[PDB]
């Protein structure tokens, strides 16, 4: 129909455009991070930059706030790229999926499941 | 009586080669509340018989003057040594009193031990009973009383009576029972007895909220009723993991 590219359905092709758009989304902030894993660590860096979006960078924005970088535990963290909205929003779905994990089974979330069950919660 | 206000826990009888040793610490509580802890719970009917308790302290009392004045109308009545009552005799009137009150719904809120020496060829203690005046406290050497000759009763609220090689009352009927049924051996030495009743004391006092660690022993032998000096008994922890600190196990969950 005309409004398979407004709706998370398939088109002729089979593709969700929407997805797509999100994706593109995330590419637009002109935000780059980068992970790198060690023998016995993980290193996480990101520029301390705010997203490419509507309003633009003042002179009395105060830059030691700017963040992408999250803890979700004590010994989970992560970097959120994106629309910071919707970044701050996953940040917060994360730090309770943790919480409720650990409160469920006594033992902390690792970071492949947090990973996993932030997915699908993202796939509804 | 309505029901225990001052209470006694547990008492453990067992013969051995030379007759009965008997055990209880020394202990009497107000509920929760270990109120007294230096009373007396085993106590001497005559040169050959014992009487130990749990429960109601002041039952247990009342039931110690009767028996104090039923030793002394015998020792009244005594022409010669074999006329002395034996400790069955005693297990038989406690078993009929505490029927009778049964009866009446007016127990005694006890368990007794009635133990002591069933005969009278061991020795010539009650050929001159001093009632007031103890002389082992001389230089000779205890008998072997076979053990058919020694008596261990049992008395509970409702009047249930039986005999046994060894006795035990309150909680020692469930910890130091299994270890005697399955450790008591006849014809015991005294090192041995001993260690049997410290091991099952050992349990009590860490499995049993009312029990102390000073234990009074007595024994019933050919010298007559000893009471041994009252003594703590050394219970250490069975395990390192108890004493291992909180906090070097994982934060996380139910760890305590």
């Not at chain 2, 051995?16 to 040793?21: F, L």
């Not at chain 2, 130990?52 to 028996?67: C, M, N, R, T, V």
């Amino acid at each position: 129909s005309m409004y398979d590219r407004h709706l998370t359905i398939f088109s002729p092709d089979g593709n969700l455009y929407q997805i797509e758009y999100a994706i593109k989304a995330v590419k637009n902030t002109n935000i780059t991070s980068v992970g790198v894993k060690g023998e016995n660590c993980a290193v996480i860096i990101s520029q301390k930059k705010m997203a490419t979006q509507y309003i633009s960078q003042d002179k009395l924005l105060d830059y030691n706030n700017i963040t992408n970088i999250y803890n979700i535990t004590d010994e989970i963290g992560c970097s959120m790229v994106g629309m910071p909205g919707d970044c701050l929003s996953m940040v917060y779905k994360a730090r309770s999926e943790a919480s409720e994990f650990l409160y469920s089974n006594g033992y902390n979330v690792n970071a492949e499941t947090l990973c996993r069950n932030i997915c699908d919660k993202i796939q509804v | 009586t309505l029901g225990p206000v001052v209470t006694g826990t547990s008492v453990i009888a067992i013969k051995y080669k030379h007759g009965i040793m008997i055990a209880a610490d020394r202990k009497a509580s107000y509920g929760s509340y270990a109120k007294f802890q230096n009373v007396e719970r085993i106590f001497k009917i005559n040169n050959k018989t014992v009487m130990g308790f749990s429960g109601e302290l002041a039952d247990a009392q009342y039931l110690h003057e009767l028996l104090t004045r039923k030793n002394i109308n015998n020792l009244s009545e005594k022409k010669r040594k074999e006329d002395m009552y034996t400790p069955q005799h005693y297990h038989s009137y406690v078993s009929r009193v505490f029927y009778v009150r049964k009866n009446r719904i007016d127990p005694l809120f006890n368990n007794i031990i009635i133990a002591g020496i069933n005969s009278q060829k061991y020795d010539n203690n009650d050929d001159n009973v001093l009632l007031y005046t103890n002389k082992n406290n001389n230089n000779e050497e205890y008998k072997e009383i076979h053990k058919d000759d020694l008596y261990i009763g049992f008395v509970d609220m409702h009047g249930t009576n039986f005999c046994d090689d060894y006795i035990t009352t309150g909680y020692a009927r469930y910890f130091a029972l299994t270890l005697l049924r399955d450790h008591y051996k006849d014809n015991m030495t005294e090192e041995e007895a001993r260690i049997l009743i410290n091991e099952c004391l050992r349990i009590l006092y860490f499995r049993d909220a009312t029990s102390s660690n000073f234990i009074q022993i007595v024994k019933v032998t050919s010298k007559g009723v000893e009471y041994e000096e009252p003594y703590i008994l050394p219970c250490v922890l069975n395990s390192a993991d108890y004493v291992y600190p909180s906090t070097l196990l994982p934060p996380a969950g139910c760890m305590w």
